[PDB]
UniProtKB/Swiss-Prot annotation:
This is Tyrosine-protein phosphatase non-receptor type 1. The keyword Membrane applies. The modification S-nitrosocysteine is found at C214. One of its GO terms (cellular component) is postsynapse. The modification Phosphoserine is found at S49, S241, S242. The gene is PTPN1. GO terms for molecular function: cadherin binding; enzyme binding; ephrin receptor binding; insulin receptor binding; non-membrane spanning protein tyrosine phosphatase activity; protein kinase binding; protein phosphatase 2A binding; protein tyrosine phosphatase activity. It comes from Homo sapiens (Human).
Amino acid sequence: EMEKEFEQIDKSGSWAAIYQDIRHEASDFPCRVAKLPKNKNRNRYRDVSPFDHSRIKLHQEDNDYINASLIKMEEAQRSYILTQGPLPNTCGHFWEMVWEQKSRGVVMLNRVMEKGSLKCAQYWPQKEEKEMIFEDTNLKLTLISEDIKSYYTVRQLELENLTTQETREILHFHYTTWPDFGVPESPASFLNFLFKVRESGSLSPEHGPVVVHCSAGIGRSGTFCLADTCLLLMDKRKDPSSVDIKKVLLEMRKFRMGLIQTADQLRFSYLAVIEGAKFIMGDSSVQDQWKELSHED
Ligand SMILES: CNC(=O)[C@@H]1Cc2ccc(NS(=O)(=O)O)cc2CN1C(=O)OC(C)(C)C
Ligand SMILES: [Cl-]
Ligand SMILES: [Cl-]
Ligand SMILES: [Cl-]
Ligand SMILES: [Cl-]
Ligand SMILES: [Cl-]
Ligand SMILES: [Mg+2]
């Protein structure tokens, strides 16, 4: 049971050991496509690649490669696409993927500039009157509105397939204060944001998988998805005791390498799930408490 385990790991100070054991046990699958010479400029990091078996294939139209993985959680009945922060030359590919996969939401957990370096391209428009056209993939993207909170921003975007003139509303959930290789400020701040994404309907099984990214699409992205999937599993069962967080993380790691990048991010995942369980099991009031503690205004 997660809370008993948490306390025992905390008491023995064994988070590093528990985390390294996950790393040891994690799946290793080929990434042959990611490593083709022609794809070198489509990868942000030499050593972070999608497995072949679970990579997202683009539908256009000469090179189908994007550094993105489908995390398909069978038991939970939820899927996510985890991807790197797009590069200056892959922003068209990124939106092509959103279109083809029928995603309704994009969750961004990094900033464009972190520690002095560009860790993600400016892939969405910052001003209504300055829309973006991706000529390579024939898409247009327009900022419709934004709601700026203290540590996150929600944006409404309109994505248009210029080939057909069909338009779709995409919601962008941008967590601006989650440091790289770090953790959210509190369980409250994290859960307030996760529940904002949930409330939007973006995770509905009626849509394609939500797109989640950070810079590599593994550390912060893995933490977010682990917490969400664990909460969903216990919600379906109404049984917190049934969820084995480490088992869930190892399952997710069948689909993309490196998910959760530090022992403290693993620790934080437990805190987030234990706290979120209060809401799942019927303490409605905790949601307002998180909103207050997150100081979002
Ligand atoms: C310390 N790790 C790194 O600097 C790079 C790139 C990177 C950036 C930023 C990262 N954080 S995040 O944006 O939250 O994924 C993770 C990584 C991963 N990485 C690796 O070499 O990863 C493995 C899985 C070990 C191959
Ligand atoms: Cl940013
Ligand atoms: Cl900086
Ligand atoms: Cl970039
Ligand atoms: Cl950072
Ligand atoms: Cl790892
Ligand atoms: Mg303006």
